[PDB]
Amino acid sequence: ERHLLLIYTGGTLGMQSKGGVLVPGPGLVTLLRTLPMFHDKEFAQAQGLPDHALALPPASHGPRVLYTVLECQPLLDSSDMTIDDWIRIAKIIERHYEQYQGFVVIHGTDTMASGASMLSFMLENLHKPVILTGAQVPIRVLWNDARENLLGALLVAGQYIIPEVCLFMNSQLFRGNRVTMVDSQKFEAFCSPNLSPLATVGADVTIAWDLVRKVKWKDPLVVHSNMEHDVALLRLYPGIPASLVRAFLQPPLKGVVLETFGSGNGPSKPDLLQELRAAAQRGLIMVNCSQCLRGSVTPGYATSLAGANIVSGLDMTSEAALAKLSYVLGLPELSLERRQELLAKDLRGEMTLP
Amino acid sequence: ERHLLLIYTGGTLGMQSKGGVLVPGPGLVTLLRTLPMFHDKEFAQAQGLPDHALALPPASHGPRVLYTVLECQPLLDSSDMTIDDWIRIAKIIERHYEQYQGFVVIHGTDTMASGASMLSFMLENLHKPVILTGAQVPIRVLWNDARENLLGALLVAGQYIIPEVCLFMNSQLFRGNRVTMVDSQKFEAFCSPNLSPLATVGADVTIAWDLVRKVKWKDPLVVHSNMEHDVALLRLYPGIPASLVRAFLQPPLKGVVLETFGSGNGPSKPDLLQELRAAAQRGLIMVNCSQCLRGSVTPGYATSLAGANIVSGLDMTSEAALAKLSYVLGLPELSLERRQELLAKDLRGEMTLPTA
Amino acid sequence: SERHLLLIYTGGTLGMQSKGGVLVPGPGLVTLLRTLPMFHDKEFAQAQGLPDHALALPPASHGPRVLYTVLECQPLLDSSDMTIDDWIRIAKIIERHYEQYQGFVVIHGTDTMASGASMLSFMLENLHKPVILTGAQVPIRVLWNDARENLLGALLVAGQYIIPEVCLFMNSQLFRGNRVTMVDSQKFEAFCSPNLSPLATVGADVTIAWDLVRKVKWKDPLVVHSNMEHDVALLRLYPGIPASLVRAFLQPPLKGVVLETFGSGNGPSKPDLLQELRAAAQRGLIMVNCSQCLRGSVTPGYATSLAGANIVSGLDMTSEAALAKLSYVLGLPELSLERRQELLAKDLRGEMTLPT
Amino acid sequence: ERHLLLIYTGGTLGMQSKGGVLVPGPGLVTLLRTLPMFHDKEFAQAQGLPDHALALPPASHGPRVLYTVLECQPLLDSSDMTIDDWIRIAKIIERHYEQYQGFVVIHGTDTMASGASMLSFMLENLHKPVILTGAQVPIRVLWNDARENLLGALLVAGQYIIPEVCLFMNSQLFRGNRVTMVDSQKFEAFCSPNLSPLATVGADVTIAWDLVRKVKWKDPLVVHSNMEHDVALLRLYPGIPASLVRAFLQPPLKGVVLETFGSGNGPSKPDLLQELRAAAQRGLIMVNCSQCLRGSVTPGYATSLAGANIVSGLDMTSEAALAKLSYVLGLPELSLERRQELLAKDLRGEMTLP
Ligand SMILES: NC(=O)C[C@H](N)C(=O)O
Ligand SMILES: NC(=O)C[C@H](N)C(=O)O
């Protein structure tokens, strides 16, 4: 047997109608009991299992998967989620780390990529799978993507030792800190633009073991609650005025991700550059990410954004750059130089160096 | 014969190295003369053509294509381009509209999509092709995408009557107000996420005539120099504080595109909503666009951003929403309600209205 | 407001079981489906005291309630053992019960699914109701599968929409049956419609391409063609293929052949090979030229293009469709060879796009 | 400096109109001289180079590339090409192997994949790049894919040590024995369904060095002219009769690739199986390949084709299986069992083992 904790945070996967809009819906365990694909009643009574614990039917070979549903309260649309919510989740995983062989987190799609990236950083030396999943259509609606997304997540966590925060949707397993949402209606909602999926499910299950990270058995799990809140994201647009940037970068901001044009460029007008420079003197750290979905930030142009306190984000997603910025700035007693060096390193598989 | 104007604004297609970085490079016409694929010397002398005018070799069928190079000054990296630059370009097209059968604009990739969208709006009732093109690698570098991108743009403008601001790159013609940049290194740099290409070039040329807009022969070209400058784009991120939004939306801002999560949603925390409401009372107009590349903004959630002075952008790119916002706000003597109604309408093929 | 469907279970991996360490066809489908809430609403069934043969889907978002009856063919087959006769039997089942039901779903193996869809497309002349083929890469009895959602989707499409075509539903896509081919032997996205958009897509909502879906011909009755010519074949060219091997392949009693050719529709121009094609034509054989390429059309243009006596271009047809069309046309009674060739060159069921 | 041989065999890249159809067109070197992108006149006179030898302009970094055009005669539409033509090409490469650092072969698209795969096998222990290229539109037609396809091939051969028979088209370098033609009109005409490209050209050049084969500097080049001609390809279709298969497999055929359904299956009707068995007793070797573009042949069904003298082709393209069959059967003095063992091995990067 293998034992999993299913953490239900909210999201469309479990929503219900009310006032003609979808809102978070409680009572997930109650529903799941009634579904044979999610709970084997015969086996449960045959082992007289507890009322909190469900049991997946069997695969021919390999371990039986059991899981316990922890329903957060209140449940949230992922658009209302913040760093504090993700810290709460990490702490749940920390509290119960020893009792369970893996974790599945049901989450809304709207900020799924931010959440996956954040947990990726907070959960240092992670040894077990943490699989985020969600859906475009609620599980209570007959034609949905929820059933197979939830089952796949449970089967991955239950059967494979992939020590990473992942996202499972639409028969693909992605590295969590590598994904971003590309489609607001279709079931293929997420893309991992700069890295293959860690796994694919079809007639058989193909895992890219060459990419999956190695379990560091010696080192214990260190959960970082010390994530810096005063970080932001700022997207450049043509003609963006210096005075607006000045305002954006005022104290108490400590870090910012600048989403720039193309290979990592912005306007070279001096008043703008002066503000970035002024912000650096105040001790602000800036990460340069491209607005483009695919490719890497690279120097080469007179418009390339480089300089004091600007670290290139290379091929990072913006969700990952923001989380990494939150993580690095939250570490105690480091110099600015050191912090910049940590930002330029691949810390959780989120960044490919040249 | 068909006559085109080639407007060279800058961009990597024509850049040179200096101090180990790429910068804008002048002297394009001088280079193009020396390249047989871009200038047929034999034919030029046989017709004793002017020194400013180049001539493509014969294509398979149809008319011979001649073109004139207008090299803007100063040439720009597209990251330094603004509304005023795009207005200058529209005015060049206006000045010479009657002398030429079509236009090609060489432009940097960095803000290409913004430029295409802006010109799309400024050039009301356009009857001729305006094809933007660019490259990831300069034409002076041997291994490049510049040669074939420039040639294709000239051949499309020269041979087909597509009355739209388009982007031609990597054997695809896209509707200008429908594109966005998706790859910062690869030659397939742009995507039209919510509309097929207008055309594809291969062994033969396939055009989607069912999508191409109709020439309005009766109506004259109206160029809009009256584009509102005080518009911005603001991307939401989780936990974005109300105080930062307050600062962003201070006067003199008149319009903003909010890039929101998923199907068009944001945080429902009251202090944030309060600021959007306060901005509306100051008369600000807000367009809701999705951060997602593909799909549409749609209501359905308690977190859907809708309300006073918020217009849904449906499936618009953010580049298009920003340009449309600049256009609509620049029109004289309209009420806020009228302006909102215009934003919710498909004005240049940039927006698809939902089905029933 | 109820709609009634017939679910015809022919075999295929969707319903297979292990035996001797290999998958083989598994009976007892209705017994399984009863126990699954997503496939049978027990509460509603007792509330209407329904028959034991008839299952009932839960309520979908809108529209009619869907009821269906399972007909389990015997013997059940791996689709690799299926032939024209099996597909004729299926067509006849649909004929027998045509009046009692509003639509049809056929569970079928993937191995020859495309051939089966194309064949039924031709046999069912003037079809007025949906016939949706579906299958799976993993059996429904195996926990982690594509079977559950593929079967449900097929039932919901047939049950809710009037698409009068033989279709294939897999992996949230509805394809025109005579337009598909199998591209992936392991992944759930197993089929592609290379030269036509899907007829429909399922997501948060259902998008149908009504401007492609064929029109119901309510005047004309259903005519089922049992008269399908069995002596037809498919022959794939490979470089250096010798004339003597082709001679042997095309011996009587063969009446028709699909030649899968290179590129835009080309083959070796060596005379001994051309002589055999010509000899076959004199014996009265008909030949259809299809490209080995997945995407594109057969077109003339090269000295190696295969054209001539009794060779009809297949344009953009799949080879599964060309073979079925060849079987259909050759089975029609009392037509000249010239007439038969004219019919092959026409789009008879939406399988072929004519040039302009 | 680096020196390349450009072998022009024919194909649309160099065709001309005549009688309203395209046919092979001579005089390539004459055309190339007049194009600055393909020949630097200033530099040539500055080094008073020979009349047979062209010189590319300077690329960004590295060596200057010079090349010599060898125009085969007669030139061919690739639909007329056979094993003998490919042997002639291999022999050209063998004759001049020491004088040149790499090779480019201009070839028609129609049988490009068969040609690439054949040369891949004939050129044992190859140490230098051999890059096939072609086009959908002739180079003499103004709007074409020929110019950039030919240049890219020269630049790859000229600048990188990739010791494989490759195909360069549309800014992608593919392993030759891994490609097949998927589009008869579009410039993206070829696909490598079961293997990433070896390289991609964009703003910079990305090579997948983890996939590129290693130069075997100890071992000399062995060219195999001994390629078995009596091999064929047979595609199954539903209901294919046993009597037609009987006829197909008659002597003197020595080997066949059976293109089967799905994961590698065919009809189980006994009269058909009997003929495969009869062919095996005559000593015929059979390779099972899938008709599907993507995936692998695998057992699992009662309809799986396995047995006496049937070797699984796993994820091989059919072009590659046919060439491998031609190669293995041409080797002198091996037992049937040995031959089968060689077929089941990855000999040139054409097959992925489980
Ligand atoms: N499909 C979803 O989950 C969207 C939802 N608004 C959420 O993120 O909570
Ligand atoms: N590829 C390019 O053109 C990038 C350049 N920085 C520009 O936009 O001008």
Ligand SMILES: NC(=O)C[C@H](N)C(=O)O
């Ligand atoms: N997945 C499948 O259905 C393949 C099976 N051999 C069949 O065609 O019946």
Ligand SMILES: NC(=O)C[C@H](N)C(=O)O
């Ligand atoms: N485009 C091409 O090269 C096709 C031509 N028929 C050939 O194979 O020679």
